[PDB]
Design a protein around this ligand. Structure first.
Ligand SMILES: CC(C)C[C@H](NC(=O)NCc1cccc(Cl)c1)C(=O)NO
Ligand SMILES: [Mg+2]
Ligand SMILES: [Mg+2]
Ligand SMILES: [Mg+2]
Ligand SMILES: [Zn+2]
Length: 890
């Protein structure tokens, strides 16, 4: 097996200074002519010249205008072109190749491919070698001169990176355009697009240098009207990087382009950012609310990469978190600032503690900077992205705003125009740390374990209060469970943001402070603490850890009601839920296994239910926050606290708990659903695509969450409220009417009516698919079969495939049916998908990640499907590696 190891990094024996491309697009072939002006590096030892080149049809190969010949001067095996050393010059030389490739048949959406009527590239991580020969690695930085030619009628818009320097006519209906990108870059940042594209545009003027930047956003003609929010989000993104980081854009022009077929969300190609349509295009009549947040965060992310990834790039792929973790951190800061809602941070935490914590206790567990890979693509993980973001955010929590900015500026300045490593970032943050502490002995060496050590720390707490001395102490322990990466886990540098609440009046007793736990355990003592406080721990979720608060439910309710920090309130709520869930889960489990004729369930705490009511009845409390409190923790969060999980028992647990709370609060839920309507569904800004009210959007989420609860409960006459809700002009509302209708005989009429409302917009139809897929229907398998036959059919669009199947995999009762039929269905889809799109196939494996956490029958059923997929002939390297790792074999 071909394993690359982080410690084996060596610079190349060659240098590529300039790339001159001619990309000639025709109906049934694309011809790529390439000149690399190359040199020998000081690390060269007379080795053969080896270029990556995958699936290329060679027309010609030369060095310095001398034709090289197969079997004599080179070999090519469809993956590497080797030029024997004897024929490799000893100093500056021009390597020329011409290859034929076929975007029209590239269903894998990596390299050059056709997405509906657009030709587009995706080069990160190893796609460039599918366009032409290269030493395809991020430390091989060069300048690019790129000409694209095509039929003019079919492809009137031609784009590549950088300044458009010439446009020309060509006989036979063709035309070309030449682009020069003056910044040194790795090949993974090359892009090209050709299409019948429409655009909206604006001019932006940089804050400090006053450079004029032309901003263009592009799509196919049909969706040109759905482009304006993206443009506004780009303007926001640029202003944020200038205002917070001092960072200005560095070309005269920046293009964003939407395409229908894209493996992930978007891509940061210099000057030419390429997006999945679902992360660039929206309109208020034709998109759900979540699209607006998605577009803001993705546009932001791709723009933030212009410094963190582009101007400072990676030495090698093991450094991925340096760009992605740090870009996600910058995106999240931007997103918090733009939205101004406490739910934006909560939603990042929620995603980490569910999806990423699951990954981190699975056999796929890896540190944010991995030690080895086979397929690069398997590293684009929530660990590398989201844990990485939290590691990058802790620097800000530790240093504070002004010292963080100073550290970041040192990082940017030192490494600008060059490659960088995670050590370079920590080194820069270390110089800021030295400054802040006044002290040159202080270092962040210990901080490096956030990059190397895998797994989630557990941070636990014990308290003492001496009421005569007015002295309170917090004793903190950390522990990380040993795993395959490290048999001994070292203590991390853990910042714990804290306050102290007076429990009789709900007020803050201290200035917020950040405890720095650097040992296995430590005791933190506070004086002049006038009464026994309740601690408010890990405010803002200050480190990526399992928190054990050792607080009573009564103390948690008090934080939930009175604490200032939205995370702590929410976490306190979450912990009360989890205690209840683990208690009722155990009771139901013992009932099943011991075959009991009768048994008891512990009821939901009645003071918690009262606190929920109190919060919900507070007209001045945040509506997004309220939607978090009435929903139980996610199943993927729960599963981290249970071994040998019986998923049907968990489903009975959640249902009892919701029913208990419902039986007390349903009238309060109904009353708030009705009284929220006027502000929730107010049409101010409905025709303005430059403006979104994120608070009002949260009112819609709350109303939609309540309706779901009332619907499942069969609250009297809720059906009329579902009917009226289907007539709202907000797609968030009318698609909600479909899924909550699942509990009624009206489902199938709403199905048809929302189908008709959705079917003429590609992205909205994809949302309708997802809504159908996640419907809480007994007959959900027959409904998937209907989606497959009537709507999905043989689509190779990843959005369509993921929309039909992924939401259903989160149906706890059905996906996990004890027959294994859900496991069998998704394995079939994975295997089918892998034959044309290995990346998407592995995304579709995600439900299998928790296999070894289930009850032993469901474990056996999942492993069987996984070993079956591993036996498929011509399984991709991507899927094989993933499944081998996930099944403890690699
Ligand atoms: C371009 C890629 C190499 C990776 C990455 N993009 C990204 O969209 N990750 C999110 C994602 C993942 C899976 C599915 C979907 Cl639908 C979306 C990124 O960082 N862009 O800047
Ligand atoms: Mg080919
Ligand atoms: Mg995000
Ligand atoms: Mg389509
Ligand atoms: Zn990124």
């Amino acid at each position: 097996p071909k394993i690359h190891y982080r410690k084996d990094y060596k610079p190349s024996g060659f240098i590529i200074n300039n790339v001159t491309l001619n990309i000639n697009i025709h109906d049934n072939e694309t011809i790529v002519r390439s000149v690399l002006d190359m040199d020998i590096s000081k690390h060269n030892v007379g080795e053969d010249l080896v270029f990556d080149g995958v699936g290329l049809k060679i027309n010609e190969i030369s060095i310095n205008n001398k034709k090289l010949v197969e079997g004599e001067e080179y070999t090519y095996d469809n993956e590497f072109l080797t030029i024997f050393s004897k024929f490799v010059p000893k100093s500056k030389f021009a390597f020329s190749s011409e290859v034929i490739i076929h975007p029209e048949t590239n269903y894998a959406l990596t390299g050059l491919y056709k997405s509906k009527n657009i030709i587009v590239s995706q080069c990160e991580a190893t796609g460039f070698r599918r366009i032409t020969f290269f030493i395809d690695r991020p430390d091989m930085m060069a300048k690019y001169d790129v000409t694209v030619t095509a039929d003019k009628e079919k492809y009137p818009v031609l784009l590549s990176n950088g300044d458009k320097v010439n446009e020309f006519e060509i006989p036979g209906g063709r035309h070309g355009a030449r682009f020069n990108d003056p910044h040194l870059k790795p090949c993974y940042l090359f892009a090209v697009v050709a299409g019948d594209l429409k655009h909206l545009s604006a001019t932006y003027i940089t804050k400090y240098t006053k450079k004029k930047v032309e901003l263009y956003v592009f799509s196919e003609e049909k969706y040109v009207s759905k482009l304006q929010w993206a443009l506004e989000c780009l303007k926001k993104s640029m202003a944020f990087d200038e205002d917070y980081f001092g960072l200005e854009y560095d070309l005269s022009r920046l293009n964003l382009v939407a395409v229908s077929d894209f493996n992930v969300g978007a891509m940061e190609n210099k000057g030419l950012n390429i997006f999945n349509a679902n992360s660039l295009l929206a309109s208020k009549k034709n998109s759900i609310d979540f699209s607006y947040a998605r577009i803001l965060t993705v546009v932001g992310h791709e723009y933030f990469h212009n410094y963190t990834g582009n101007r400072v790039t990676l030495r090698d792929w093991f450094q991925l978190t340096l760009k992605e973790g740090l870009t996600v951190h910058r995106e999240n800061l931007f997103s918090e600032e733009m939205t101004k809602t406490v739910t934006t941070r909560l939603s990042h935490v929620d995603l980490l503690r569910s999806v990423q914590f699951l990954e981190d206790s699975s056999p796929l567990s890896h540190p944010i900077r991995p030690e080895s890979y086979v397929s690069m693509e398997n590293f684009y993980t929530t660990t590398v992205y989201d844990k990485g973001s939290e590691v990058m955010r802790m620097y800000l929590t530790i240093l504070g705003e002004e010292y963080y900015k100073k550290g970041f500026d040192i990082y940017i300045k030192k490494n600008d125009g060059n490659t960088a490593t995670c050590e370079d970032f920590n080194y820069a943050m270390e110089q800021a740390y030295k400054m802040k502490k006044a002290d040159n002995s202080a270092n962040l060496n210990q901080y490096l374990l956030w990059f190397s050590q895998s797994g989630t720390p557990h941070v636990s707490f014990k308290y003492n209060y001496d009421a005569e001395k007015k002295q309170y102490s917090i004793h903190v322990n950390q522990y990380t469970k040993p795993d395959e990466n490290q048999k001994e886990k070292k203590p991390l540098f853990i910042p714990i943001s804290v306050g102290l609440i007076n429990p009789e009046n709900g007020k803050e007793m201290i200035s917020q402070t950040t405890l720095e736990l650097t040992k296995e355990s430590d005791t933190f003592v506070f004086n002049n603490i006038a009464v026994k406080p309740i601690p408010s721990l890990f405010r803002g979720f200050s480190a990526p850890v399992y928190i054990e608060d050792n607080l009573t439910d009564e103390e948690r309710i008090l934080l939930l009601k009175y604490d200032s920090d939205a995370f702590v309130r929410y976490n306190s709520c979450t912990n009360i839920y989890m205690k209840q869930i683990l208690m009722n889960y155990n009771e139901f489990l013992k009932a099943k296994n011991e075959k009991l004729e009768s048994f008891n369930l512990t009821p939901v705490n009645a003071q918690f239910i009262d606190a929920i009511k109190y919060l919900l009845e507070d007209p001045h409390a945040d509506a997004g926050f309220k939607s978090y409190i009435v929903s139980l923790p996610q199943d993927r969060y729960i599963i981290n606290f249970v071994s040998n999980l019986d998923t049907d028992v968990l489903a009975d647990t959640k249902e009892y708990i919701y029913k208990q709370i419902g039986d007390k609060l349903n009238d309060v839920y109904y009353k708030m659903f009705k009284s929220l309507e006027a502000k929730a569904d107010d049409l101010t800004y409905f025709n303005d695509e430059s403006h979104v009210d994120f608070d009002q959007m949260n009112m819609r989420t709350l109303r939609n969450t309540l309706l779901s609860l009332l619907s499942k409960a069969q609250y009297p006459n809720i059906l009329n409220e579902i009917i009226e809700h289907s007539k709202s002009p907000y797609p968030s509302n009318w698609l909600t009417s479909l899924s909550v209708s699942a509990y009624f005989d009206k489902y199938f009429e709403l199905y048809d009516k929302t189908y008709k409302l959705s079917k003429d917009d590609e992205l909205l139809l994809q949302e309708w698919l997802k809504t159908v897929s996640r419907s809480d229907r007994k007959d959900i398998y027959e409904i998937l079969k209907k989606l497959e036959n009537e709507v999905l059919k043989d689509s190779k669009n990843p959005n369509d495939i993921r929309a039909v199947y992924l939401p259903f995999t989160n149906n706890l009762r059905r996906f996990h049916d004890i027959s294994g039929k859900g496991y069998k269905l998704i394995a079939e889809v994975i295997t089918k998908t892998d034959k044309f799109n290995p990346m998407v196939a592995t995304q579709l494996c995600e439900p299998f990640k928790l296999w070894n956490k289930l009850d032993t029958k469901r474990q056996e059923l999942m492993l069987n499907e996984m070993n079956t997929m591993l036996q498929e002939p011509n399984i991709s390297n991507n899927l094989k590696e993933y499944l081998l790792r996930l099944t403890n074999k690699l």
